[PDB]
Design a binder for this molecule. Structure first.
Ligand SMILES: *[C@@H]1CC[C@]2(C)[C@H]3CC=C(C=C)[C@H](C)[C@@H]3C[C@@H](O)[C@@]2(O)[C@@]1(C)C(=O)O
Length: 145
């Protein structure tokens, strides 16, 4: 019925950027436009995370993929459309497409975590809320490494 945890990707500096917020009613689909962190960046690394903490290392890793072929351009210029789609079949599709060329890549994640363990991740997130927000402020926008 609901996404029991926030679902997102890692932005510059190991920052958790949520696309599907905790308690979102399923089916659900969200999209954010992302960019490159450094000049002439040839591609982006999509790292799929679950959890509430501000830094991805403290959340759970679900999968990875790279979208390469990004032409040389300055930082913050390329447009990378990243969509998270949760279906009613227990299939999570994460797609990243380069808006300039149409070049894309994707990962499929299925549901095959305990209720208490889910309850702990949200407990831990509000306990570490301040420390997490400090690291976020210090290290962060919509930039992808
Ligand atoms: C944490 C790990 C991932 C997942 C099993 C999700 C993976 C695939 C999905 C497909 C529609 C769902 C978005 C799943 C929702 C949820 O059960 C899940 O996010 C967690 C909390 C889990 O229970 O293992």
């Amino acid at each position: 019925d609901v996404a029991p945890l926030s679902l997102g990707l890692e932005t510059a500096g190991g920052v958790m950027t949520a696309l599907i917020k905790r308690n979102s009613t399923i089916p659900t689909k969200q999209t954010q436009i992302f960019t490159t962190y450094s000049d002439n960046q040839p591609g982006v690394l999509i790292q799929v995370y679950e959890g509430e903490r501000a830094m991805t290392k403290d959340n759970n890793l679900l999968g990875r993929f790279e979208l390469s072929g990004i032409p040389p351009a300055p930082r913050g210029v390329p447009q990378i459309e990243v969509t998270f789609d949760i279906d009613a079949n227990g299939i999570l599709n994460v797609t990243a497409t380069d808006k300039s060329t149409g070049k894309a890549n994707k990962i499929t994640i299925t549901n095959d975590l305990s209720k208490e363990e889910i309850e702990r991740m949200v407990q831990e997130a509000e306990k570490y809320k301040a420390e997490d927000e400090v690291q976020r402020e210090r290290v962060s926008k919509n930039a992808l490494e």
